[PDB]
């Protein structure tokens, strides 16, 4: 692997690694309480032996620049972070894969960037959502205080999340966990659109998902394909991420 640095529209440095390969160029986008290490720890990276893999730390996470404001964590800023990575490696065609809110980010990048030939959203759909202001603020307070890492650790452990997902929360600054949570009130509630007719859009979730409705809505509205994994919940579906990587490798082949 080589490391890289790019700059987002608002000047935030975005750091990541590039794993060279002769195949498709794949850009991986992690979730809120994660960083770029989850791709190797989940086994997703090893499931793609031929791809040229680009994995970034989103703003405020890992080795990327700190933010510390709610508006600095607006969805549009994450989109700009990812598009800056697409610029650095100069390809005309990219395949994006994102986990949880990283899936929402990947879908929105696909909507605005004609260089995205494929977008895969793992355990997130593309539809408009209602975000309760009070509950999200409550959650921001819980995750940003001294007990925030334990709060997330206990929540994810209790819901059967994989160990790498539990452990990743403690590597995110508490202040950025709070700011990213509040950032969801700045645009993340809108649906995503199809970027161009030839795009391959894929949604993935647990076959036991208690709310599959919006995933089917994405099939109808965007012409997206729906992949299911054997799990009772979205969090437990994260235990299937390496398996999903193998299926992604099949598409890329």
Ligand X SMILES: COC(=O)C[C@@H](NC(=O)[C@@H](NC(=O)[C@@H](/N=C1/NCC(=O)N2CC[C@@H](C)[C@H]2C(=O)N[C@@H](CCSC)C(=O)N[C@H]1C(C)(C)C)C(C)(C)C)[C@@H](C)c1ccccc1)c1nccs1
Q: What is the DSSP letter of 72?
A: G
Shortest reach from residue 114's CB to ligand X, in Å = 24
- Which residues, other chains included, contact 21 with Cβ-Cβ below 8 Å and sequence gap of 6+? 48, 49, 50, 51, 52, 53
- Cα gap 202→122, rounded to integer Å: 8
Burial class from Cβ neighbours inside 10 Å (0-12, 13-18, 19+) for residue 175 reads: middle
Shortest reach from residue 2's CB to ligand X, in Å = 29
Instruction: Identify the residue among 29, 51, 110, 152 touching ligand X (CB under 6 A).
Output: 152
CA-CA-CA-CA dihedral for 76, 88, 194, 201, to nearest 10: -120
Report residue 54 as tokens: 């680009």
Question: Whose Cβ is closer to ligand X: residue 24's or residue 80's?
Answer: 80
132 belongs to the binding site for ligand X (CB under 6 A): yes
Q: What region does 105 belong to: left with phi over 0, alpha with psi -120 to 50, or beta?
A: alpha
Strand partners, 94: 116
Which part of the chain contacts ligand X (CB under 6 A), choosing from 25-33, 49-57, 107-115, 196-204? 25-33
Instruction: Identify the residue among 57, 139, 144, 176 touching ligand X (CB under 6 A).
Output: 139
Shortest reach from residue 253's CB to ligand X, in Å = 29
235 belongs to the binding site for ligand X (CB under 6 A): yes
Strand partners, 7: 13
- Cα gap 98→119, rounded to integer Å: 8
Q: What is the DSSP letter of 60?
A: T
Shortest reach from residue 246's CB to ligand X, in Å = 22
- Size of residue set near ligand X by CB under 6 A: 22
* 149 is annotated as contributing to ligand binding: yes
Instruction: Identify the residue among 135, 146, 197, 220 touching ligand X (CB under 6 A).
Output: 135
Q: Which residue is nearest to ligand X (CB)?
A: 100
Task: Give the per-residue contact string, 30-49, with ligand X (x = CB under 6 A; - = no).
Answer: -xxx----------------
Known binding-site positions for Zn(2+): 149
In the complex, which residues of this chain contact ligand X (CB under 6 A)?
31-33, 100-101, 104, 124, 129, 131-132, 135-136, 139, 143, 152, 155, 181, 184, 188, 233-235
Binding residues, as ranges, are 149
């Amino acid at each position: 692997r080589d490391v890289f640095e790019v700059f987002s529209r608002d000047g935030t440095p975005i750091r990541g690694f590039s794993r060279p390969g002769p195949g498709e160029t794949v850009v991986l986008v992690h979730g809120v309480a994660m960083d770029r290490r989850i791709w190797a720890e989940s086994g997703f990276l090893d499931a793609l032996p031929d791809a040229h893999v680009l994995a970034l730390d989103l703003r405020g996470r890992g080795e990327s620049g700190r933010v510390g404001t709610a508006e600095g964590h607006a969805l549009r800023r994450y989109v700009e972070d990812v598009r800056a990575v697409l610029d650095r490696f100069g390809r005309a065609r990219y395949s994006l894969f994102g986990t949880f809110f990283g899936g929402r980010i990947a879908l929105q990048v696909a909507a605005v960037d004609t260089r995205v030939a494929r977008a895969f959203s793992f355990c997130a759909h593309a539809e408009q959502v209602e975000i309760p202001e009070d509950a999200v603020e409550e959650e921001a307070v819980a995750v940003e205080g001294p007990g925030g890492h334990a709060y997330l650790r206990d929540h994810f452990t209790g819901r059967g999340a994989p160990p790498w997902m539990v452990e990743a929360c403690a590597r995110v600054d508490p202040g950025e966990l709070g700011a990213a949570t509040r950032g969801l009130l700045h645009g993340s509630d809108r649906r995503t659109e199809r970027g161009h007719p030839d795009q391959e859009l894929v949604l993935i979730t647990a076959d036991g998902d208690a709310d599959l409705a919006p995933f089917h809505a994405g099939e109808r509205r965007l012409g997206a394909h729906l992949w299911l994994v054997d799990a009772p919940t979205r969090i437990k579906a994260a235990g299937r991420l390496a398996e999903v990587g193998r299926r992604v490798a099949g598409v890329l082949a």
